Amino acid sequence: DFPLANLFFVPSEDATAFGRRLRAAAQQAPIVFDTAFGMPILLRKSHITTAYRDTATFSTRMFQAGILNGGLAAMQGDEHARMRRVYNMFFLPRAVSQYEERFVRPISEQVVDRLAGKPRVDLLEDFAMELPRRVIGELFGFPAEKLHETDERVRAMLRGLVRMHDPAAVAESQRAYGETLGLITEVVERESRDTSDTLLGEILRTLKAEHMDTIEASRQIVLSLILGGYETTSWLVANTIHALLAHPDTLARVRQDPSLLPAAIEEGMRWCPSIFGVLRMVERDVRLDDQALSAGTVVCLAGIAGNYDETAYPSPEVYDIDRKPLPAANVFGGGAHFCVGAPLARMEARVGLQALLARFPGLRAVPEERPSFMYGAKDSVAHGPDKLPVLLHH
Ligand code: HEM
Ligand SMILES: CC(=O)[C@H]1CC[C@H]2[C@@H]3CCC4=CC(=O)CC[C@]4(C)[C@H]3CC[C@]12C
Strand 58-59 to strand 31-34: parallel, antiparallel, or no bridges (unpaired)? Predict the structure, then answer.
């Protein structure tokens, strides 16, 4: 029914190639069948907006088939709303700013410290991944190093959530989750005791108060903070750094005026998104204009296909932090499932980049070796760089 295409697993040293490829496809067809994901990809903005809104027709029930079953993302309707309110409490604005003061800022300074005394580093492994890892460590009360040991299992878990029709990816996802459950069980057990003094402890306490603290619910809260809070957040920071490093005049301006960091992050999400969109399951035969989707089909909403719509964002290939209005983020999903941790991720990007920019006025990309970009970078489910080598000193 749909044209076939390979939208995602395509390397380039041009960070805009991904955004431009999706926009190009959207001009050819509203829906394409991706040969690597093995599912229809919705590219048309009105179709995506409809899909996000009509949750009875476009559900997240595909997540009942894999490792997210039992967690928030797999829930629908009232069960979802009820668990969502619980999660919501911990990402309210005041809670976020409490995290910023009490640990994101000190951790950021510590991470930057470890970069001192070296002439060159890779800001991907040594910053973008380090900072979110240590934040989750703080929320768990467990050493960041412990999470670092899970990197490969974490990425294996995520790959199967996207390519959920691929038996090898799904099996490795399930197996990786099994190989991480000892860890997850240890963390849950510790912070579920009355002696817990961690944010995770407070969350488990809240689930307990609502009589929702089943083994699976508690494990899924930890799983989401790892998959989202650590791995997925890393790529947002990485892409924001690449955008600044690639545009040294904008980087200098941001260093001179760190109040611009929110605009740098948002434009970065338009210009170099780390995620394409979301998955939904079609619950009933539906037609979207001339396109028909059959009940039971799993689809991807590629909300980022509009990031490079020139009629919406002129000169879309230009990383312009001064755009008015600032682009609406498409990397957090939509509808009732819109990412609940996004406020934490956005704050970490700002607070970490501030600490970095202030400490190294000489910060610049190593002008030799260029980052290579693709969806699937480093075996992730992100579009991001393979490395971000910089020079820190003049
Ligand atoms: C740059 C960082 C992040 C990005 C781009 C991101 C992206 C996403 C996306 C695309 C979804 C699917 C939404 C949908 O189906 O509409 C999602 C959901 C979710 N994420 Fe985030 N994530 C990030 C960080 C985080 C963090 C830090 C946490 C935990 C603190 C988190 C926890 C969750 C949860 C629990 C869901 C399920 C929400 C629901 O179904 O209602 N994520 N995220
Ligand atoms: C529910 C949950 O833990 C969240 C936190 C991290 C999220 C994911 C983050 C990565 C992401 C990229 C996509 O394109 C599909 C949705 C996914 C695969 C998200 C699904 C749900 C996740 C796994």
Answer: unpaired
State the closest ligand 1 atom to the C-alpha of 60, by its place in the atom list counted from 1.
15
Residue 233 main-chain phi, psi, to 5 deg: -65, -35
63, 69 Cβ separation under 8 angstroms: yes
- CATH number for the domain spanning 15: value is 1.10.630.10
- Distance from C-alpha of 394 to C-alpha of 392, rounded to nearest angstrom: 7
Task: Say how far apart CA 7 and CA 241 lie, in whole Å.
Answer: 24
Atom 12, ligand 1: residue with shortest CA distance? 333
Domain that residue 360 falls in: 1-394
72 CA from centroid of ligand 2 (Å):
11
* C-alpha span between 390 and 101 (Å, rounded): 28
- Number of independent structural domains in the chain: 1
Residue nearest to atom 17 of ligand 2 (CA): 278
| Pocket of ligand 1 from Cβ distances under 6 Å | 60, 72-73, 84, 87, 224-225, 228-229, 232-233, 236, 274-275, 278, 331-335, 337-342, 344-345
Q: How far is the CA of 68 from the centre of ligand 1 (A)?
A: 12
- Known binding-site positions for heme b: 80, 84, 280, 334, 337, 339
**Measured distance CA(254)–CA(350) in Å, rounded:** 11
As given in the structure block, the two tokens for residue 196 are 């817990």
Joined together, the tokens standing for residue 214 give 């089943």
Determined by which method?
A: X-ray
